[PDB]
Design a protein around this ligand. Structure first.
Ligand SMILES: *[C@@H]1O[C@H](CO)[C@@H](O[C@@H]2O[C@H](CO)[C@@H](O[C@@H]3O[C@H](CO[C@H]4O[C@H](CO)[C@@H](O)[C@H](O)[C@@H]4O[C@@H]4O[C@H](CO)[C@@H](O[C@@H]5O[C@H](CO)[C@H](O)[C@H](O)[C@H]5O)[C@H](O)[C@H]4NC(C)=O)[C@@H](O)[C@H](O[C@H]4O[C@H](CO)[C@@H](O)[C@H](O)[C@@H]4O)[C@@H]3O)[C@H](O)[C@H]2NC(C)=O)[C@H](O)[C@H]1NC(C)=O
Ligand SMILES: *[C@@H]1O[C@H](CO)[C@@H](O[C@@H]2O[C@H](CO)[C@@H](O[C@@H]3O[C@H](CO[C@H]4O[C@H](CO)[C@@H](O)[C@H](O)[C@@H]4O[C@@H]4O[C@H](CO)[C@@H](O[C@@H]5O[C@H](CO)[C@H](O)[C@H](O)[C@H]5O)[C@H](O)[C@H]4NC(C)=O)[C@@H](O)[C@H](O[C@H]4O[C@H](CO)[C@@H](O)[C@H](O)[C@@H]4O)[C@@H]3O)[C@H](O)[C@H]2NC(C)=O)[C@H](O)[C@H]1NC(C)=O
Ligand SMILES: C[C@@H]1O[C@@H](O)[C@@H](O)[C@H](O)[C@@H]1O
Ligand SMILES: C[C@@H]1O[C@@H](O)[C@@H](O)[C@H](O)[C@@H]1O
Lengths: 181, 207, 207, 181
């Protein structure tokens, strides 16, 4: 069920630096000067994957080694790109994230804390369109399940979501890397 | 000779991506006689050049007030890096150096609660929506209100008040027409703060 | 020569019957050389004698700071009467007169509303009770909290904030244990203001 | 049903000046030095009348000519005397009052506004213990009723209440005078 994903350079916030293969993303310290198209996140270090999902089972992995914050997930293609907003399952977002080094949360509203005895170095995101499901796996810990959203409905196209996080604390400059699968 | 003061960015600005935070280097009175000022700026002792010089201002004192403005990156300020302004001038023997940075203290997460109007107020024709925001450190914060994706600008916000634990709290009052509240409209209190996930959160308030 | 500043009572004091409001008349530096000060006090130009002289204080400047204190009747201050402090001293040629009084402005009635804790807070082990007080003028006010006839002192009160109509509002937060709130106990927000009937009102808050 | 009432000097706040016959009261500008007994109001210009009512019909009048503020009524003998409190019928007080020159109010909780086209110069207070009632009459306007408390219950002793009001605005120095009846 694995899927090769590439980061969509039109979604990408201007402080992000994507790699030439479009398979890594990091938050850099200058703002790149680039089009202000509708598709682009203007207030957070976030980026979409190129793929659009309409049906099917899709699975991919992301590497978060060494990082103190990030966000990962799938989202509606209709999510809003301009301004501040919450990552919430009522709002088009099926994500989980790490911030403040060490705090893990699932993006339910209100939010759900996660206790991970083994901090993931990689995370697998699995999407099952018809089952109405998105699950997350801690690959470092034998693939154990971290969290699963269910009865998501799903009407339209879904896109993979990514964010390398903010660099509070100065020790979050690594990038997310999509694993070769 | 000439005096110099260094100033920090306005706190909200370091948190509003739509704002631009600047450190200001003020030089007061430079003689009509020897009026030209050199500014050097260092960020964590490293020389930078993007700084904006402002045209000198004549003072009723018959003296010169000279400013240079330096824009800072948000995360640079937040991450506590030091910003040095070195002034040079001939009404003066040796270059003066000033350094500033963000204040120390372990940041704490704001807790946000919205409280509806008291039923006693629903006799007046405008009502007050409250956003309590508490437990946060430092006091640098930004609060705003929105309804249905448009901003609501009829609001006032108390300054942050120190609590018994050393954290801050404030309240934000949005005044609205009783008919808008009564109809069932959804208002939202919004908060931007260093110690929030993605530095932002929001809470709803409806009937 | 010697300088003089006149000071108003602290605002709460003019409203708390348990407080005593004083106008202070400060004389700064009087010479070690000629150190004796005469004070004369007038209330609406009428001479008064109940004023308390404080013992002179030695200043690191090698100079004398001399104070006289004058207690005022509450209603006198509220009713805008003028309090004059005339200083006399030989390090000085002619007696200096200073006058003070209560600020002008048509007083307006505070509206008081108590708002219970947000249900989101009931997961923490202390909770916040809010008293919104608004529409009041002038800013001089006093707020306090009580439960079952005893005072509750674990509260903090924002300063008054100017609103769009030129009136003031503030909020008071009382933190209590969740078990006290949850049990059904009655808390009361209490307000003293010039423009209240009998200068005082209170509102309850319970589950 | 008329009753000759005298102001009780032990209830009286220290800023009040009672008359020698104990039939007038005004708010003076010095504080009289006097006992701190339990019976005495310490924080408002208030005074009880000497009578204690246990039953029966009782009626008296008070003159308010020229005043910008006062309070009148009956109360439980048990009302608290020390500190701040509200004049409220839930709390042992069956009173109406005038403040701010021109604003009349009935001491229900919350409070009830009163619209008087003819400002009273005298007010009659009628108490009917068994009927559980306290009524007020605008003697200036033929005796018209201003306001009536009912179903007051009444268990204990009741006392007539008086206060000449605060002197906000400086033109409230006249006294209350009980009318000769
Ligand atoms: C000739 O006449 C001139 C001018 O009239 C006199 O000038 C004064 O010289 C004084 C030194 O001798 C100097 O004293 C210091 O005062 C400051 C505070 O000054 C601020 O507030 C004043 C109003 O109270 C104003 O005069 C100033 O404008 C200044 O305001 C702040 O300035 C910031 C710079 O622009 C600004 O920040 C920026 O804001 C923008 C938004 O516009 C951006 O967001 C940007 O990011 C920011 O960086 C602030 O908004 C603004 N703030 C406000 C609300 O006013 C004081 O802090 C300092 O105090 C320290 O030091 C002394 C001793 O060193 C000590 O006693 C203190 O306790 C403390 O440690 C100084 O006392 C004056 O500032 C200056 N006046 C002016 C206009 O600059 C000359 O001295 C005269 N010469 C002679 C020979 O007589
Ligand atoms: C020798 O050294 C001495 C002392 O170090 C110098 O003394 C100073 O002289 C200055 C004049 O040359 C003078 O400047 C004025 O300052 C005042 C504000 O001062 C207040 O705050 C200061 C701290 O910032 C303190 O120094 C003072 O204590 C003062 O505090 C207030 O004092 C009130 C009196 O007690 C008090 O009120 C009472 O409160 C009590 C409770 O205790 C009761 O409730 C009572 O009822 C009240 O009445 C207040 O609580 C208290 N407030 C607080 C929070 O501090 C300033 O207002 C004034 O400003 C006006 O005038 C100038 C020009 O005239 C103008 O520029 C202004 O804009 C404004 O119009 C003066 O500037 C200093 O006050 C004084 N310092 C002291 C300690 O008194 C000498 O000058 C030196 N001499 C030489 C030769 O160098
Ligand atoms: C004390 C003050 O310092 C600053 C200036 O804005 C004013 O003009 C004044 O000189
Ligand atoms: C400027 C200040 O004025 C006042 C005093 O309390 C301080 O000592 C200082 O002299």
């Amino acid at each position: 069920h694995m899927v090769h994903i590439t980061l969509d350079p039109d979604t990408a916030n201007p402080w992000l630096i994507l790699s030439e293969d479009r398979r890594q993303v990091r938050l850099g310290d200058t703002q790149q000067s680039i089009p202000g198209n509708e598709e682009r996140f203007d207030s957070y270090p976030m980026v979409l994957g190129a793929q659009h999902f309409h049906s099917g089972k899709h699975y991919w992995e992301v590497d978060v080694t060494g990082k103190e914050a990030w966000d990962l997930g799938v989202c509606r293609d209709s999510v809003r790109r301009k301004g501040h907003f919450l990552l919430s399952s009522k709002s088009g977002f099926w994500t989980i994230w790490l911030w403040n080094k060490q705090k893990y949360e699932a993006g339910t509203y209100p939010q759900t804390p996660l206790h991970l005895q083994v901090p993931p170095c990689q995370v697998g995101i699995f999407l099952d369109y018809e089952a109405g499901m998105v699950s997350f796996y801690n690959i470092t810990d034998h693939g154990s399940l971290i969290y699963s959203f269910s009865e998501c409905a799903f009407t339209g196209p879904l896109r993979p979501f990514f964010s390398p996080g903010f660099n509070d604390g100065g020790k979050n400059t690594a990038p997310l890397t999509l694993c070769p699968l | 000779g000439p005096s110099v003061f260094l100033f920090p960015p306005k706190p909200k600005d370091t948190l509003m991506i739509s704002r631009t935070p600047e450190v200001t280097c003020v030089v007061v009175d430079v003689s009509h006689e020897d009026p030209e000022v050199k500014f050097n700026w260092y960020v964590d002792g490293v020389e930078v050049h993007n700084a904006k010089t402002k045209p000198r201002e004549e003072q009723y004192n018959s003296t010169y007030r000279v400013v240079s403005v330096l824009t800072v990156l948000h995360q640079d300020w937040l991450n506590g890096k030091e910003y040095k302004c070195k002034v040079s001038n001939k009404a003066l023997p040796a270059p003066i150096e000033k350094t500033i940075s963000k204040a120390k203290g372990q940041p704490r997460e704001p807790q946000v609660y919205t409280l509806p109007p008291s039923r006693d107020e629903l006799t007046k024709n405008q009502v007050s929506l409250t956003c309590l925001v508490k437990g946060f450190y430092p006091s640098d914060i930004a609060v705003e209100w929105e309804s249905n994706g448009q901003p609501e600008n009829n609001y006032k916000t108390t300054p942050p008040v120190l609590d018994s634990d050393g954290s801050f709290f404030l309240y934000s009052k949005l005044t609205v027409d009783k008919s808008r509240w009564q109809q069932g409209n959804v208002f939202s209190c919004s908060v931007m703060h260093e110690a929030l996930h993605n530095h932002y959160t929001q809470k709803s308030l409806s009937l």
